């Protein structure tokens, strides 16, 4: 077994990123803006 397969380096690390966005198209099937006010506001 390789060291890389069972060990991680101290400086090497991942982070999590989150964001809000909109998706266009969809041939319908999108959000119901009446029940999703934030969609129309954005």
């Amino acid at each position: 077994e390789r060291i890389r397969d069972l060990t991680s380096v101290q400086g090497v690390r991942e982070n999590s990123l989150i964001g809000y966005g909109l998706v266009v198209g969809l041939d319908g099937t999108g959000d119901q803006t009446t029940q999703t006010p934030f969609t129309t506001q954005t």
């Binding site: 809000y20 966005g21 909109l22 506001q41 954005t42």
Partner: protein, 58 residues
């Protein structure tokens, strides 16, 4: 201006020159009350209007 500007955010003020709208709608009301009272009344009486012969001494 070359600054970055988000698309979906609520366009809040972010820098020195940014402008914001303020709705005052201020309403304050405070009240305070206090009271105290004290009444004392007394009235005593005593009279014979007729004294027995044996009690006339006192």
């Amino acid at each position: 201006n070359y600054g970055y500007q988000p698309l979906f955010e609520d366009r809040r003020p972010r820098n020195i020159g940014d402008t914001l709208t303020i709705v005052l709608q201020e309403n304050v009301s405070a009240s305070k009350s206090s009271s105290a009272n004290a009444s004392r009344d007394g009235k005593t009486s005593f009279g014979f209007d007729t004294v027995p012969r044996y009690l006339q001494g006192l």
